[PDB]
Symmetry: D3
Subunit: 182 residues, 6 copies
């Protein structure tokens, strides 16, 4: 993934746990060489999976829980580190934002040539609920999606209950979530 993703992980870990901790995860993940992540450069995805794996081992939390915290954090990180207006433009409520998410990432991708964005399709089941289809070239990120959705609930002051009902990891076509909001 692009370096910004790995910077955001470093940032969350640094700020929640301090540098020493960050350095220990970084060392563990096999990454002590790298002096700093370059935000607009492409990195092999293993970099990210190794960080989360190392953070899990070093912090004594499951991987899923780090990916959940990271997803939530990302909503704050993008808004504060150069993408605040882009976020704002993608809408004003949870239901709208999720409909715009493919278009948001298409705009990201204008600037990040090599982006491999997720794809999100909403089927609204009521004015307060939907079924969300999450399609990705990557494996293993559903818990980051749950995190992101809660981050978005906070951003819109909207309570969000989310349950995953299909699992790309067991060989289903893709992840699917039922969501109720406000």
């Amino acid at each position: 993934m692009y370096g910004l993703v790995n910077k955001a992980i470093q940032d969350m870990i640094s700020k929640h746990h301090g540098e020493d901790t960050w350095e220990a995860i970084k060392q563990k993940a096999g990454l002590e060489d790298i002096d700093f992540f370059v935000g607009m450069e492409a990195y092999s995805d293993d970099v990210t999976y190794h960080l989360v794996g190392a953070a899990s081992e070093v912090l004594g939390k499951p991987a899923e829980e780090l990916l959940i915290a990271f997803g939530e954090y990302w909503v704050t990180y993008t808004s504060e580190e150069g993408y605040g207006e882009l976020l704002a433009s993608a809408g004003d409520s949870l239901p709208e934002f999720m409909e715009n998410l493919d278009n948001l990432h298409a705009r990201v991708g204008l600037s990040f040539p090599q982006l491999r964005p997720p794809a999100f399709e909403c089927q609204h089941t009521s004015s307060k609920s939907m079924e969300l289809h999450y399609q990705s070239t990557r494996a293993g990120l559903a818990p980051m999606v749950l995190g992101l959705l809660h981050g978005l609930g906070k951003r819109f002051q909207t309570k969000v209950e989310v349950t995953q009902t299909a699992f790309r990891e067991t060989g289903e076509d893709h992840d699917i979530f039922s969501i109720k909001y406000e």
Copy 2:
């Protein structure tokens, strides 16, 4: 037009008149189905013309006057809902901004693939006046242009006197305006 246009109309009407009023216009325009406008999605232009037509009937104001208020509002709405830096970059005075307006919309259009922007050509007649040519794929929006120009005068603390001297609605090639400023 893109959904953001219709959100901005909903916003202006909601904030100036309350929700109930907004809902009544929305119902009248034939649009009660739509739970929310999706900002980065393309809508049929009739959506917008129907809203203005319904707002006219429900508020008891002429259509032109709504389109005038809307034009002015739009200068505030874009600056506050995700396009504040883009607006800033298009310049620092009325004369400059209008020269940049085609380039501004070309930048908008990078992100809105399907954009059909207006085209604006300035002929400066003095360092305090110009003749503005407004060319559009759409009919009926000259009063939104007058609105926008006054919104831009406010933004630059510049007094703006604008008169329309050619009328695309009577079959002239396009709308033209004489403008004096400061």
Copy 3:
């Protein structure tokens, strides 16, 4: 419009009437300064209108009649002068091509930054007809659209009868054409 349009007019007139006629037309249009048109450079629309009025004068043909000739010509010109794959990609039947026309001009628009390309909306009224809405920032080019549709007919080996039912020139919102096709 971009210089490719002006080159096409020069080429058409030259081919059909010889160079002496072309030079006369160019001179009458007030354009003898211009040594050659630069294909990817933007020109004032006025350049094209002057060429067409001057050609009308010099040839004894109405301008509208020349614009029909020019519209058919453009389909061949574009296919032979650098856009043949782009054209092929837009479809292999009349109705399909007309549906892809905005997307064709969007692809043109990636290469011509300053493009102001017409917008075309199809309402298919059966498998052998459609209503075509032509929306344009410019005036006076509906007869070219008639010639283009005929060029496309020949391209597909499809007979097509085009009849205009609404006229921008007279103050209607946009040109609308009723199209029967085999």
Copy 4:
């Protein structure tokens, strides 16, 4: 997927089995409403899957076997229907072409705003082999990738033996193919 993919299936099936068979397949897929596919318009992925399942049913062939046929076909189709220079530009040998494949789809992606194109990573294990990582937002298209590689073999006049070693469908992170080539 974009309509060009669906056109290609229709063309392949038509060419190989005639129109009556094609119309039967299209009808069985629940698509008799659709008068023709619009090449540059986005369709629900479901349209393509339904066509392939309906073709499998109507022809007595497994869907996977049709997707291989379709993958080989696409290499010829794209080269003949508007993408021949683009294809040529991506290389003049199998390994080179496979290395340029993301960059080829990035160029496709400039023209198809909403493209969701596969990601392909090569690990060259010698001058006569590589391991190919196929990563996709979509399920079920690994057999098409097998057919495409064979089409590319013919394009280069290179024999190629493709054997899949990892399977998304069964829950593995992504499809991985082992490729020997002359």
Copy 5:
């Protein structure tokens, strides 16, 4: 260069020296005709070199020193006149920002079609130093680069010692700088 560059020069001179002074430089540079620079329009580069030359003569400072002040100012000007989020996104420290600078300008260039950005390559010689290669289509701007680097040191609260060790002006391939930081 694009008009924004010349606006930024006018701004720095105006704010540091007042308008009268600005007007005198502007007059001297042969530019009194131009009522205002259009930020997103392309200008001949001589415009910029003439301004700096005139400012040098009128202010009684060497050209290099103006270009140094301008470079530093530019880091503030972009951050405040519409590019603050873009700047933020290009990173969080001197070493990272300089690695992202080509990507930053590639993003600028999406919006400025005709941009001729510099190219910057970093060779890191320690976690506190590098060798920076500055490649440009233009001559004469090395002192603006030194200015920019100090502006970036301020932005990141990082002390920066920079020495130029190759000179494109004497016919070396390009400018090179040794840099130590913090």
Copy 6:
């Protein structure tokens, strides 16, 4: 530079001198590691310079003389290897083509994200001459520009005499060529 440039050199040398000579050159350049060039991948400029110095050594020809040969070759190569329509689109005469050259590279630059393409400015000094300003982030490629102009002469069936009057290498701001053409 992007791998297409290196492929072109390999192709030229191979075609003209056979493979054994090519392999010798590649080995002498220190590049025997590289199994093949990837057309759409960016390479360090050094790769190209090393190939040219190594070819000069192995063939007994000055590097400048090879770069002329390479410049003529590129006009044919690009027209035959995927860019023939793009080339055709840039004009049908020498002067027109030279005026469109920046716009041609802008279109190339949409496909090659990281392109650093030369800038070319024409001052037409009559209908049979121009002064050509070649501005480049890179050193040493003026003799290639001489070969390209000759390739373009042949393309148009236009004799052309190119004589360089200003030299970057010696410290002048940029290369300037005086061009007479039939």
